[PDB]
Design a protein around this ligand. Structure first.
Ligand SMILES: Nc1ncnc2c1ncn2[C@H]1C[C@H](O)[C@@H](CO)O1
Ligand code: NI
Length: 360
C-alpha cells in the first residue's frame, strides 16, 4: 500500500460502500430484482471506470438500493460489514454518512426506490445503523461514528434529520451533512435546510456540507456563511476564488478531499492540477477519503496511491493530514485526544510532547 499506517476517514457514504455479495444475497432473499446475478456482474453495472457527471453517478444507486432499503436485517448488517471492511484499509477512525430516509419505507415522503409502505421509519434506521457500527467497532477495533445527511432535493426531510442527530447523539451520531445534487438553484437556502443547520448550531450538533464538488465557489460561500458549516465535503471549487480560499485557510476550515471520486464524477478534470496539491503545498487542513467506494471500485489505497504516484505525496504528508483529520473529527475532545495519542504512537511521534503542543 502507499501508506500502510493508521488512517482516519471523514467522508464516506454507507450506502455507497455496501458489499456486492450482500446486495446479491438480499436481492435474492427478498425477491427484489437486480441488474446482474453475480457480484462481478453487479460491479460491471454499478461501477464506474471513466468520468461521467454527478447526476450519472447518483443514478447508480437506483440499481441496488431497492435490495437493502426497507430491510432491518440488511441495514444493521451493512453497518457492521462497513467497519469490518474499513479495518482492512488500515483505518482506525471513520465517520460514515448516510440518509436514513433513503433506507426507510415509512414516514418518508416520497417513499424511495418504488417501495410499498412498510413499518421501517428513518428513526429506526438510525438506531439500527448505530447498533451495527457499535458491534463492528467492538469486533474489529475501528472506532466508528455516523453522520446523517439532509438531501438537497428534499428540504422537507431536514427537520427530521437534525431531530435524529439530537436523539441519537449517544448512539454514534456526531454530525449533520447535506448531500445530493449540488446544482439545484438556491438549494442551500431552502428553509428546511437553513433551519436544520441553525438548529444544529443552537444544539451543538457538528456540521459538514457537500459544496464545491461540482458547484461554484458561491455554493461554498453558502455552506460557510449561511449553513455555518465546520467542514467542506470536497470543496475543490473554493480554489476558483483566491480570497475565499484565504479566508477559509485563516479560519482553519477542514476540506474533506476525495481524489479518485473527484475524477470519476467529473468534479476534477485530469488535465488540470488537483486542488489537493495546493492544499498540500500551503499545509492546509484536509483529509483523504473514498466517498463512494462501491461505485468507484476503490479503497483508501486507491486515493493514497494516486496522490503518492502522481502528486508526490510523502509519508510525512500522509501522517500530517491524518493528524489534521483527527483534530477536525467530530469526536468529543476526550476521544479526539485518545485518537491523536493512538496516531502519535503508531507514527513514532512523542505522545506527551505532541499532546502538550496541542494545548496551544
Ligand atoms: N459525494 C457525494 N456528493 C453528492 N451526493 C452524494 C455523494 N455521495 C453520495 N451522495 C448521495 C447519494 C446517497 O444515496 C446519499 C446519502 O449517502 O448521498
Ligand atoms: Ni460524498
Amino acid at each position: 500500500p502507499a501508506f500502510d499506517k493508521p488512517k482516519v476517514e471523514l467522508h464516506v457514504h454507507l450506502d455507497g460502500s455496501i458489499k456486492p455479495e450482500t446486495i446479491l444475497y438480499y436481492g435474492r432473499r427478498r425477491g427484489i430484482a437486480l441488474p446482474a446475478n453475480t457480484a462481478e456482474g453487479l460491479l460491471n453495472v454499478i461501477g464506474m471506470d471513466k468520468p461521467l457527471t454527478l447526476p450519472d453517478f447518483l443514478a447508480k444507486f437506483d440499481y441496488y438500493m431497492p435490495a437493502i432499503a426497507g430491510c432491518r436485517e440488511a441495514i444493521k448488517r451493512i453497518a457492521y460489514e462497513f467497519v469490518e471492511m474499513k479495518a482492512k484499509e488500515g483505518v482506525v477512525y471513520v465517520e460514515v454518512r448516510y440518509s436514513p430516509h433513503l433506507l426507510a419505507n415509512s414516514k418518508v415522503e416520497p417513499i424511495p426506490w418504488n417501495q410499498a409502505e412498510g413499518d421501517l421509519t428513518p428513526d429506526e434506521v438510525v438506531a439500527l445503523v448505530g447498533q451495527g457500527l457499535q458491534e463492528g467497532e467492538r469486533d474489529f477495533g475501528v472506532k466508528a461514528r455516523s453522520i446523517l445527511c439532509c438531501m438537497r432535493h428534499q428540504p422537507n426531510w431536514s427537520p427530521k434529520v437534525v431531530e435524529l442527530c439530537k436523539k441519537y447523539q449517544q448512539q454514534t451520531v456526531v454530525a449533520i451533512d447535506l448531500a445530493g445534487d449540488e446544482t439545484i438553484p438556491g438549494s442551500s437556502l431552502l428553509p428546511g435546510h437553513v433551519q436544520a443547520y441553525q438548529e444544529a448550531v443552537k444544539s451543538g450538533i457538528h456540521r459538514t456540507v457537500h459544496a464545491g464538488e461540482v458547484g461554484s465557489a458561491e455554493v461554498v460561500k453558502e455552506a460557510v456563511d449561511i449553513l455555518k458549516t465546520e467542514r467542506l465535503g470536497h470543496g475543490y471549487h473554493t480554489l476558483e476564488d483566491q480570497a475565499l480560499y484565504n479566508r477559509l485557510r485563516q479560519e482553519n476550515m477542514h476540506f474533506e478531499i476525495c481524489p479518485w471520486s473527484s475524477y470519476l464524477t467529473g468534479a476534477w478534470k485530469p488535465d488540470t492540477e488537483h486542488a489537493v496539491i495546493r492544499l498540500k503545498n500551503d499545509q492546509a487542513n484536509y483529509s483523504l477519503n473514498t466517498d463512494d467506494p462501491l461505485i468507484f471500485k476503490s479503497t483508501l489505497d486507491t486515493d493514497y496511491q494516486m496522490t503518492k504516484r502522481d502528486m508526490g505525496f510523502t509519508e510525512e504528508e500522509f501522517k500530517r493530514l491524518n493528524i489534521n483529520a483527527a483534530k477536525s473529527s467530530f469526536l468529543p475532545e476526550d476521544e479526539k485526544r485518545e485518537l491523536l495519542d493512538l496516531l502519535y504512537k503508531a507514527y513514532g511521534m512523542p505522545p506527551s510532547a505532541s499532546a502538550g503542543q496541542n494545548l496551544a
